[PDB]
Design brief:
Chain A: Its main location: membrane. Chain A: It is a multi-pass membrane protein. Chain A: This is Gamma-aminobutyric acid type B receptor subunit 1. 2 copies of one chain form a homodimer. Chain A is an alpha/beta fold and 663 residues long. The first copy, chain A, has 3 domains: 186 residues, Rossmann fold; 178 residues, Rossmann fold (3-Layer(aba) Sandwich), CATH 3.40.50.2300; 248 residues, Rhopdopsin 7-helix transmembrane proteins (Up-down Bundle). Chain A is built from 20 helices and 17 strands. In chain A, the strands form 4 sheets. A 7-stranded mixed sheet of chain A has the order 7-6-8-9-10-13-14, sandwiched between helices. Chain A has a 5-stranded parallel sheet with strand order 2-1-3-4-5. Chains A and B meet through α2, α5, β7, α6 and α18 of A and α2, α5, β7 and α18 of B. The complex binds ligand L9Q (2 copies), a molecule of 2 linked components (NAG-NAG) (2 copies), the ligand C[C@H](NC[C@H](O)CP(=O)(O)Cc1ccccc1)c1ccc(Cl)c(Cl)c1 (2 copies), 2-acetamido-2-deoxy-beta-D-glucopyranose (4 copies) and magnesium ion (2 copies). One ligand SGG binds next to loops of chain B.
């Protein structure tokens, strides 16, 4: 005779998860297969005492104590629902019992302080998370947003996920759990601009949140969505009275969302401990269901029950000492615990290895929605990092997005059609100045050319030419210069402007000063002006010299955000030096024009109109430029136009008539 | 004899909430007081069968069934913790038992589908939320924030709070879930700008999150913090290993945080069903505790046990039929249920009424931290809406902040000192023009003044005067005008400028053409210019007239957020018409200066020519400037006004000063 052995079991034949329909037949098949074998428990015989629980802890504790405070005496319990398993595991160390939940996937059952006798063949839900991070590091996403329904599972899953992301060079950006309304969740996902979402919720919360993401147009090539694989295929094509949207409005919202689930069946065909395979066990089972698989609940979680009872039989074989087990002996349970901890074998679900938490690790699966059809992608094992991709992820732009918009620092440059025009004009001006200088030099014998002070009109021409040349450097801002030779340009601007204007006005101003005092000493002042200019410029460049500075405008650009930067070479006390120099030159302009109005009565009376014109131009242009600093292509426009027009006018005024009369 | 009646109970003497230490003595006192009375249950006698539970659902179901599958037969259960109460209350309909919890504050127990036999003398935690809304609506806060520890309570409290805020003219603006360490919670409260926070967490979580709110400088006059008042007084002055901060860095971070907590004791002195009061019941109890109250556990939740057993005895007196109670009869339990829901009486804890969810309502007492001291504030009742202020809320800014930063619309105006100086200058210019006109009119016979066309110099002066007048409308942007007269100004600007510049430059240019003929025919062109100007201006005002347009710049200048506005008036095609007009007038300027350069040899000719050249260069360098500086006041107007005034001054002096200097 065989010493009978009993095991309590609680099978949910109804409720949120009806997984007893397909997991009672599996347990019975496994009992038959383990008792037919005469090498496992030949001295004993396993027997089952089933009770319904409805995945309800009220129906559950009643039957638990009906099967606990009654004979026969049990050696183990098998609760499937997370709630019943949680209650049973917590309230078993008080009876010295082992609990072997074949269908509970609550991370809270991985704790050994409350659940010191708990083992399960059903992987936890945290086991999606080793995958997600090992799916972010691939695509390198460090900024993440998470949303979670309020359930007894998803509350711990994101905790595990944060703990696992911290140690993965990744961080979270947004998280908000909705009890019943996901709208403000999506509203903040749109406000915070989270392009990567991790959606933990059941089918109904899904159909309720996707009819909100569509309403918020928060999908497409700039948004990714992770979910769970448990949702039945073709779940968005189902009535959703609370979802005001429609099939066509959702199928586009859930287009290309990733889905990490677990695999509860060895895709291999290699035999197992029971000399059976998956394709064979599925048939042997479906031959025992009064209903069909699609109508039989818990059909994907039957192999877990099979493997659980098989692991029980094994870990009970090593022990082999059981007919004398009472609810007060904390030693038989410890023997069975050390036998179950060391439980390694290949069952229908795969290789079962119970971690220290009691749970078992398994192979994660990954899918992606590709036109109303789920398309497997890859597998991942949190044990050996063995990631088996399949190159089937069809994104929108051939590659996946990233955390956030990239702020590219763009530089603003002149139109580059204005620069060419101003430069052509300045070159023509230099040509004209040289032509006039030559016509004057060659005119060293004529009277009108002899009377007109030529040694000062030549200086006027030289200064006008220098100023004209100052045009090209005024536009070099990166399109044609580098950060190394850039101070060269920012210094050439200053020196050319300074010296050119100094001479161009000193000649024509000493001429009027002489005309005044007189109605070869002119060279004295004609040189003293340039000397004061050189001295003040050197003092400026010694005290506060020019150096490159980048000015950043308001960041915006119509998936990158281009923040514009202007390359302005400016000193620290710049404005002060500019104001000082402009004030000195303005005093000088005003004195020159006053002396011109006073001394109106050779070739010195015409220079007065030129003086006044240059004066008004510079006076109206300097402050303009000082104000238009924040604008390129306009400040330079006025500066270059003022320079070139002053030059053209001065030259054609006080050099042209000479030839017009001498020609 | 008396037919004994038994009561199963589960008292937590250890765990997160050790509330059996002070609730077993209270139970026993209640049983003594309810059996010493011969007018409640004279045929019966209540007896207790207790078991410790440690607020542990493992140590709890063991004893539950040691007292369920054993004799004697129990008629009711009394669990204290919320885990234990959630475990029992769902495993009682299976035995047809009544569950009467004196210490469970979980909203999940206000459900009749899982817990149809459950009553509790301990109010739920949702009972804080009717207060909070009745404390937001007052201070007008439609945008709030939340964070929640991970517990079996706070998860449902914010659910109730959303359900109750939606239906009260309120809307949430943030939420999160501090599980292990609050770091992103506060960071997003700073980023999302949550100035109103509702933090539900246990003391450990508090001391852990406040050493982060400080580190983030997320407190002050612009932030308000709501909490629960269950934390013991002077709880921030305690060691905090993970909280690198200290009392000095926390006492300032928890300054002025509201702590709405329930009141478990009648502050009144009125007697109760037991002919006892609060100041007396507390003494009688403390005379039964081997430890000190502050050191004893569950000392504030004993009155609830007393009231619970009294309610049980009352609702069991009406029923009076109990010595034959089996676990399979679903009728005695229904009698006791209809007797318990109809239970109203004044006990130590107050008025003991049981809502449809089994729970009871009560009085929430508000508190606020004022210098390391909790300062009571008005109570509240979710039923009567009765709020009883004490007027002790000491805010920082003499008043409480609001949800966000009020965005004000700012109208930028001219310096208003520039305007005065420039107006003075334009007025002096008009005075000068009038003086010169009067002189030119008086000396109309002298050849020195008979040569210069006076019928045209008068027009030049009239135009200069009009242009000078155009300076005043150019600075009226609201500081001196309203939205009604503002188009009048945006029309006067146009007409004065146009007509004055016409009568000036057209007149001088026709005079130049006339003197060119040498190298009433002039009146013809001097009038045709102004006529074409009037025609084109009327076309513009009839097709695309000027209307006030506002320019909005980026918000800046920092709790008021200043939204800057620019009072402009430019038509839709304003740029097009302006460019057309400026191009035409520039062509005319160039033609005039060319005719002058050609007529430089052929009275008042060179003066007119120099004036033409100056006015031309000034207008040419000034118009596009003012067109680019549209987005800048005090600069565009500055250039425009200085140009107009200098053009007027010069065009007047150049050709009227020599006249008088020679005629003197
Ligand atoms: C009244 C006139 C006062 C000045 C008279 C003398 C002129 C120049 C001497 C001082 C020049 C300092 C320039 C330093 C660099 C700088 O900040 O340069 C300025 C730009 O240039 C100016 O502001 C100078 C304009 C001067 C125009 C004067 C009128 C024309 C006179 C021509 C006369 C010629 C014939 C004479 C007879 C700021 O660039 P930034 O940071 O945006 O970077 C480059 C951005 N593209
Ligand atoms: C080249 C020719 C240039 C001169 C054209 C003069 C004739 C007509 C100009 C018509 C301008 C219409 C302006 C409508 C209102 C408006 O928005 O006008 C604009 C633009 O103003 C201008 O552009 C005025 C330019 C006048 C100065 C240049 C010419 C001086 C000639 C002086 C001659 C005097 C006599 C000589 C003898 C500014 O306001 P807003 O949006 O910032 O708001 C109010 C802010 N406070
Ligand atoms: C497991 O099943 C396989 C196939 O059903 C068994 O392999 C057969 O064993 C029989 C012995 O009765 C042989 O006659 C056949 O030739 C085998 N077929 C093949 C394809 O190998 C195997 O023996 C079973 N394992 C056991 C019983 O331990
Ligand atoms: C309730 O208690 C009060 C006082 O605690 C009782 O009133 C006293 O009654 C006694 C009778 O034993 C008198 O001697 C005292 O003079 C009363 N004192 C006061 C202040 O009234 C009252 O009788 C009690 N009610 C009951 C027992 O029903
Ligand atoms: C893989 C997992 N197996 C079943 C859990 O193990 C039962 P649970 O109690 O842990 C969570 C639970 C789930 C549904 C309804 C109530 C509860 C699972 C999860 C969701 C679904 Cl839809 C399916 Cl088909 C399968
Ligand atoms: C008013 C309430 N009285 C006790 C609850 O009624 C027991 P609970 O189980 O419902 C929640 C619970 C509380 C603490 C530790 C574990 C659990 C209460 C709430 C918070 C605190 Cl910190 C305290 Cl001291 C007291
Ligand atoms: C073979 C094996 O892994 N045995 C484990 C042991 O390592 C671990 O210390 C113990 C803790 O429960 O569980 C058992
Ligand atoms: C405290 C209380 O309610 N006592 C009642 C009493 O009023 C009633 O007269 C009697 C008869 O039903 O039962 C008891
Ligand atoms: C059962 O235990 C026996 C030892 O008595 C053994 O040798 C056999 O391999 C066991 N069956 C297994 C491990 O499947
Ligand atoms: C009290 O309970 C009874 C049923 O026993 C029910 O009819 C009644 O509505 C309840 N009272 C309230 C206020 O819900
Ligand atoms: Mg799937
Ligand atoms: Mg308090």
């Amino acid at each position: 005779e065989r010493r009978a052995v009993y095991i309590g079991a609680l099978f949910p034949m109804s409720g949120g998860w009806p997984g007893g329909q397909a997991c009672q037949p599996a347990v019975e098949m496994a009992l038959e297969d383990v008792n037919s074998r005469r090498d496992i428990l030949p001295d004993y015989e396993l027997k089952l005492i089933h009770h319904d629980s409805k995945c309800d802890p009220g129906q559950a504790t009643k039957y638990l104590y009906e099967l606990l405070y009654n004979d026969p005496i049990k050696i183990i319990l098998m609760p499937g629902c997370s709630s019943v398993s949680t209650l049973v595991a917590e309230a078993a160390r008080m009876w010295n019992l082992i609990v072997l939940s074949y269908g509970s996937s609550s991370p809270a059952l991985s704790n050994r302080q409350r659940f010191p006798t708990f083992f399960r063949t059903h992987p936890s839900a945290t086991l999606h998370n080793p995958t997600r991070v090992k799916l972010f590091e691939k695509w390198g996403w460090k900024k993440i947003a998470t949303i979670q329904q309020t359930t007894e599972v998803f509350t711990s899953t994101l905790d595990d996920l944060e703990e696992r992301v911290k140690e993965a060079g990744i961080e979270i950006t947004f998280r908000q759990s909705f009890f019943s309304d996901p709208a403000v969740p999506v509203k903040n996902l749109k406000r915070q601009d989270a392009r990567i979402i991790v959606g933990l919720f059941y089918e109904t919360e899904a159909r309720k949140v996707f009819c909100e993401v569509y309403k918020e147009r928060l999908f497409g090539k700039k948004y990714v969505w992770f979910l769970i694989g448990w949702y039945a295929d073709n779940w968005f094509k189902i009535y959703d009275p609370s979802i005001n949207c429609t099939v066509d409005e959702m199928t586009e919202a859930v287009e290309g969302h990733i889905t990490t689930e677990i695999v509860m069946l060895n895709p291999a065909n290699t035999r197992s401990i029971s000399n059976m395979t998956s394709q064979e066990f599925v048939e042997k089972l479906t031959k025992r269901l009064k209903r069909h698989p699609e109508e039989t609940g818990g059909f994907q979680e039957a192999p877990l029950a099979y493997d659980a009872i098989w692991a029980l039989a094994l870990a009970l074989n090593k022990t082999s000492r059981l007919e004398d087990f009472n609810y007060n002996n904390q030693t038989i349970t410890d023997q069975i615990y050390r036998a179950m901890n060391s439980s390694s074998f290949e069952g229908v679900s795969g290789h079962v290895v119970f971690d220290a938490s009691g749970s078992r690790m398994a192979w994660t699966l990954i899918e992606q929605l590709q036109g109303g059809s789920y398309k497997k992608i890859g597998y991942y094992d949190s044990t050996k990092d063995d990631l088996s991709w399949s190159k089937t992820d069809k994104w929108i732009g051939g590659s996946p997005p990233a955390d956030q918009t990239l702020v590219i620092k763009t530089f603003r440059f002149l139109s580059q059609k204005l620069f060419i025009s101003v430069s052509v004009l300045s070159s023509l001006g230099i040509v004209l100045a040289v032509v006039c200088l030559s016509f004057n030099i060659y005119n060293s014998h004529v009277r009108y050319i002899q009377n007109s002070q030529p040694n000062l009109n030549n200086l006027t021409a030289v200064g006008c030419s220098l100023a004209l040349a100052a045009v090209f450097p005024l536009g070099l801002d990166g399109y044609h210069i580098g950060r190394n030779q850039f101070p060269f340009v920012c210094q050439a601007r200053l020196w050319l402007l300074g010296l050119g204007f100094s001479l161009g006005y000193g000649s024509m101003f000493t001429k009027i000063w002489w005309v005044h005092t007189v109605f070869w000493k002119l060279y004295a002042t004609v040189g003293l002006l340039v000397g004061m200019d050189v001295l003040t410029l050197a003092i400026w460049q010694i005290v506060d010299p020019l150096h490159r500075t980048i000015e950043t405008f308001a960041k915006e650009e119509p998936d990158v955000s281009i923040l514009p930067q202007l390359e302005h070479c400016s000193s620290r006390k710049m404005n002060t030096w500019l104001g000082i120099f402009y004030g000195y030159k303005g005093l000088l302009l005003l004195l020159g024009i006053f002396l011109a109005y006073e001394t109106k009565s050779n070739d010195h009376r015409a220079v007065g109109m030129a003086i006044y014109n240059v004066a008004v131009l510079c006076l109206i242009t300097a402050p303009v430029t000082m104000i238009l600093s924040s604008q390129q292509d306009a400040a330079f426009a006025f500066a270059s136009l003022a320079i070139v027009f002053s030059s053209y006018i001065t030259l054609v005024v006080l050099f042209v008539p000479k030839m017009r009369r001498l020609i």
